[PDB]
RNA sequence: GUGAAGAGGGAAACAACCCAGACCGCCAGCUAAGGUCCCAAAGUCAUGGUUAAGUGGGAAACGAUGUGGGAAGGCCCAGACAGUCGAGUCGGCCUGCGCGGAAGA
RNA sequence: CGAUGUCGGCUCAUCACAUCCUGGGGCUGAAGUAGGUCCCAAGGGUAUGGCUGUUCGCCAUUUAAAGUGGUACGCGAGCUG
RNA sequence: UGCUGAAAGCAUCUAAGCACGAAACUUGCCCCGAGAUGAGUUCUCCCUGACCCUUUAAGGGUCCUGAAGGAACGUUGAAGA
C-alpha cells in the first residue's frame, strides 16, 4: 500500500470570511497561514495546495502589542544603490492596511511556486466589505 | 493616593454625566468633558478599579483633573501675562490677540474656542477661560513668541515670573 | 485649472515699446473638442478628453471614428486628457479656446524633446573627456570607470552610461504668458519649450505659484 | 545641556527625572547643571 | 610590467 | 577528545563543538542532543512567578525615585514626613529581572 | 607563488557619519556683532593655482564650506606611467 | 521646548491626556510605470454559416466565409545603429 496522496484537480477548496477587527497580526497571521497551506486537512499533501480561500475584512483595524504600532518597521530595497526604504506599522496601517496582513502571511507561508500560489486565495480588506458573496464563504473564528 | 483619597465636593449649580468612562461637569461658565483612563473608577469619589497595575497613579490624575473641572464652571480659570520691552504692545480684536514684539511683522495669536481675552494696559494680557489646560496652553503660546531674556527680563512674561537677570561680563 | 494641446509653431520675439526683447515660442493653440467626460463614478477620477485639429477621414479607423460619433465632434489628430479641479465643470462636445488662458501669467509646457539618437556619455551626462593628448590610449571620450572592484563586484542601477538621448516627455515650468490672440489661435510664451517646429504641446496653467 | 553617562544632583536644586526613558538632571536654580543621558 | 613586481 | 581517516541528527549556513559510530533492505516502533505559533516534524501544554526593554535577539567602568523579593533600622496619633494637617514616612543593606552608557561604511 | 598588476594622478563614482557648509537646538566666562562647547541632522553642497612622482604638506588667492573615513591604500580586460 | 498631570499632599514635559518642533522621513514638483502574472479601468469597433466523424470533449476534420484591424510593400521624417 502507497500512502494517500492529494490530486490538485479533485481537491475540495471551501471559503471563508474572517475579520481581523481586534485580533492579533501574528496569531491571525498564523491561522491563515495554516488554512491556506491545508495543515488543517487529513488529506494535506506537501506538493499539493489543499488549503482553503480565505477572505480577510478589517484588514486596517488588525492589532499589535507593546509599542509595535509605532516601533515595527518595514524595510524594503528598490533595487538601487541607497534604496532602502522603511515604514513603520503605523505608517503601513494608514497607506496600504491590507500589505501588513499579507506582508505577515506570506512570511509564513513556504517559498517557492507553492507557496506563492498557497498565497493566491488569501483575499484581504481594508474594510467591512468584500465583493464574493457569489463564492459564499462561511464566518471562520479565528 | 492620598490625591484620589480625597473627594470632590460638588457646589451648587453643577450636574454630572457618567457615561461609562466619559464625565460632562457642566455649570454656569461652561461644559468640559473628559474621557477617563480605563484603571479609574468615578462615583464625586475617585478609586483604583482592580486588574489594573497603575490604579492609584491614574486615580490621582483623574480626581486633580475633575477637581479642576469644577473651578472651570464654577469660578473658571485667570492667566495673566505682562508684556515688558520698549515697543512691546498687545491687543485685542474678537478672539484674535495682536502683539508688537519688536519684529518685522506683525503677530496675531488666534485663541481657540474656550478662551477669551482683554487688555487691560497695552503691556497686559488677561486671558480667561473654564479649561485649566487650555488657557495653559495660549499662555504658554503668547509666552513663546518672545521668552523672556536674560538680560534685561525683556519679552512676554507670566505676571508670576521671577525672571533671573544677569549681567553682561566684565569688559 | 484644465490646459490645451498646441502645436510649436516656432520661435520669434516680440520688441517691447521700452527696449526689450521677448524671445517667444509661437504655439498654435485651435480648438480643443471635449470627446469623453470621465467622471468618479464609471471611471473612479474627473477628466476631459480633448481632440483638436483634423485627420484624414480614410485615416481614422472605425473604432476611432465610433468615440468621435458619440461624442458628436469632427475627428482630431490625437486625444488627450486633463485632470478637472474640484469646481470645473464641462460638457461632451464643447470646444475650449486658446481665451481660456486669457488671465492666466504663466504656464507649464510639456512636449517630446528632440531626438539625438544614441548619445555617449560626454553628451548625455556632462562627462568630462579624458586627455586628448599626454598619452592617451583610444579613450578620449570614454567614460572611465564604470564602478569599485570585488566589494561590490558589480555596476549599480542608475550608472551614467551611453544610450539613446531625447526624444521624451519634458515639461518646462512657470513660462510667462506673452499674448493671448483669440482671433489667430495663438498663444505667445516666453522662451524655449521642448521639441521640433511642428510637435505638439500641451500648454497647462502653471503648477508652481 | 550636559550629555554624560554618568548624570548626577549637583545643586541641591537639582532634581532626577526620567523622561520617556532617559534620566535626566533638571535644576530649577542653575541652567548648567540641566543633563541628560544617565 | 611585472605583476606583484619586487 | 574529535577531525585527519567518520557518514547520520543538532548548533540558520559551520572539518576539529553537542548527540552519535553508516554491513544491506523496510511507506514499522522507541529514544539522544536539540526541539514542539507559521516557514518546519511535535504542547498556541499545565501550574506559579518575573520582564515592558522586542530586554529576550552583542559589550565595560560608571550613572539612575525603573520594577519584584528579603532582612533589619531611624522617626511617628506626647501628630511624623510633604506642602493647622491626619498616617504612615525617611534612608541605607542584601537580592531577581530590566534601563542609559551603545558611532561605520 | 601552474601570477589576486603593484604608489600616485586622470575618468567615473558609491556608502558611512565620528558634520566642513547650509537646517534645528541646549549651555556659555551668550549685551549686540562674533565666538566657545555639546546635542539632533547625511537633503544637497563641499575651490583654483605655485612647488613636489608624490599621498601628504607648505604657500598664493578664493569660498557658505574647501569635511573625515570605507569601497582590493574604490577604479590599468577604463586611460596614464 | 512646553501645557495639564498624578504615582510621590509638594514638585515633575509623562505615567493617562494635549501642544509645538529641522534641508533628514511621507507628500507636494518632474519622468518612467499594468510582465502591478495582484497582468487593473473606461470608450469605441468587428464577427450572428453549414456539415461530417471518433476515443463524445474547452475533441478533431471538411466545405463556405475572411470582419474590425494588422502586417507587408512603397514615398519618407526635426524618429532612428
Ligand atoms: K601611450
Ligand atoms: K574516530
Ligand atoms: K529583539
Ligand atoms: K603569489
Ligand atoms: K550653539
Ligand atoms: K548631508
Ligand atoms: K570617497
Ligand atoms: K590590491
Ligand atoms: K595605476
Ligand atoms: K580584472
Ligand atoms: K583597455
Ligand atoms: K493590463
Ligand atoms: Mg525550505
Ligand atoms: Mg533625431
Ligand atoms: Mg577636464
Ligand atoms: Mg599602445
Ligand atoms: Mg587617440
Ligand atoms: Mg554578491
Ligand atoms: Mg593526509
Ligand atoms: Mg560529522
Ligand atoms: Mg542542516
Ligand atoms: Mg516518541
Ligand atoms: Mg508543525
Ligand atoms: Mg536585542
Ligand atoms: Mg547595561
Ligand atoms: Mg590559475
Ligand atoms: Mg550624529
Ligand atoms: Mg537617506
Ligand atoms: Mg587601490
Ligand atoms: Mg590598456
Ligand atoms: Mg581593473
Ligand atoms: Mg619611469
Ligand atoms: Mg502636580
Request: contains cysteine.
Amino acid at each position: 500500500m502507497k500512502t494517500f496522496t492529494a490530486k490538485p484537480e479533485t481537491v475540495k477548496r471551501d471559503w471563508y470570511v474572517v475579520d481581523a477587527t481586534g485580533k492579533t497580526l501574528g496569531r491571525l497571521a498564523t491561522e491563515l497561514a495554516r488554512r491556506l497551506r491545508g495543515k488543517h486537512k487529513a488529506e494535506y499533501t506537501p506538493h499539493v495546495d489543499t488549503g482553503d480561500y480565505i477572505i480577510v475584512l478589517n484588514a486596517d483595524k488588525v492589532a499589535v502589542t507593546g509599542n509595535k504600532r509605532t516601533d515595527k518597521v518595514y524595510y524594503h530595497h528598490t533595487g538601487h544603490i541607497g534604496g532602502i526604504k522603511q515604514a513603520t506599522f503605523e505608517e503601513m496601517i494608514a497607506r496600504r492596511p491590507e500589505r501588513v496582513i499579507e506582508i505577515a502571511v506570506k512570511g509564513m507561508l513556504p517559498k517557492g511556486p507553492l507557496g506563492r500560489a498557497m498565497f493566491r486565495k488569501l483575499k484581504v480588506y481594508a474594510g467591512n466589505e468584500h465583493n464574493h458573496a457569489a463564492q459564499q464563504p462561511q464566518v471562520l473564528d479565528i | 493616593s492620598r490625591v484620589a483619597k480625597a473627594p470632590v465636593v460638588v457646589p451648587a449649580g453643577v450636574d454630572v454625566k457618567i457615561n461609562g468612562q466619559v464625565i460632562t461637569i457642566k455649570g454656569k461658565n461652561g461644559e468640559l468633558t473628559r474621557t477617563l483612563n480605563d484603571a479609574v473608577e468615578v462615583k464625586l469619589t475617585f478609586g483604583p478599579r482592580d486588574g489594573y497595575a497603575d490604579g492609584w497613579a491614574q486615580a490621582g490624575t483623574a480626581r486633580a483633573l475633575l477637581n479642576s473641572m469644577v473651578i472651570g464652571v464654577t469660578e473658571g480659570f485667570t492667566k495673566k501675562l505682562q508684556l515688558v520691552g520698549v515697543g512691546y504692545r498687545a491687543a485685542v480684536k474678537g478672539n484674535v490677540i495682536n502683539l508688537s514684539l519688536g519684529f518685522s511683522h506683525p503677530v496675531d495669536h488666534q485663541l481657540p474656542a474656550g478662551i477669551t481675552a482683554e487688555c487691560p494696559t497695552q503691556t497686559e494680557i488677561v486671558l480667561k477661560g473654564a479649561d485649566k489646560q487650555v488657557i495653559g496652553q495660549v499662555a504658554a503660546d503668547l509666552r513663546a513668541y518672545r521668552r523672556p531674556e536674560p538680560y534685561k527680563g525683556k519679552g512676554v512674561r507670566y505676571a508670576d515670573e521671577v525672571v533671573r537677570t544677569k549681567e553682561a561680563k566684565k569688559k | 485649472m484644465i490646459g490645451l494641446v498646441g502645436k510649436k509653431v516656432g520661435m520669434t520675439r516680440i520688441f517691447t515699446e521700452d527696449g526689450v526683447s521677448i524671445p517667444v515660442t509661437v504655439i498654435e493653440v485651435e480648438a480643443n473638442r471635449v470627446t469623453q467626460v470621465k467622471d468618479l463614478a464609471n471611471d473612479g477620477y474627473r477628466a476631459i478628453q480633448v481632440t483638436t485639429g483634423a485627420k484624414k477621414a480614410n485615416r481614422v479607423t472605425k473604432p476611432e471614428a465610433g468615440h468621435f460619433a458619440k461624442a458628436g465632434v469632427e475627428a482630431g489628430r490625437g486625444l488627450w486628457e486633463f485632470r478637472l479641479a474640484e469646481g470645473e465643470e464641462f460638457t461632451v462636445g464643447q470646444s475650449i479656446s486658446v481665451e481660456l488662458f486669457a488671465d492666466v501669467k504663466k504656464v507649464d509646457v510639456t512636449g517630446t524633446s528632440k531626438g539625438k539618437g544614441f548619445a555617449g556619455t560626454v553628451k548625455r551626462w556632462n562627462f568630462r573627456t579624458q586627455d586628448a593628448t599626454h598619452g592617451n590610449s583610444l579613450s578620449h571620450r570614454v567614460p572611465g570607470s564604470i564602478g569599485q572592484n570585488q566589494t561590490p563586484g558589480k555596476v549599480f542601477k542608475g550608472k551614467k552610461m551611453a544610450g539613446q538621448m531625447g526624444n521624451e516627455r519634458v515639461t518646462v515650468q512657470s513660462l510667462d504668458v506673452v499674448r493671448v490672440d483669440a482671433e489667430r489661435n495663438l498663444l505667445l510664451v516666453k522662451g524655449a519649450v521642448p521639441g521640433a517646429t511642428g510637435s505638439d504641446l500641451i500648454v497647462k496653467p502653471a503648477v508652481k505659484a | 545641556m550636559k550629555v554624560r553617562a554618568s548624570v548626577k544632583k549637583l545643586c541641591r536644586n537639582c532634581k532626577i527625572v526620567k523622561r520617556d526613558g532617559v534620566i535626566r538632571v533638571i535644576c530649577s536654580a542653575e541652567p548648567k547643571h540641566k543633563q541628560r543621558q544617565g | 610590467k611585472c605583476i606583484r613586481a619586487p
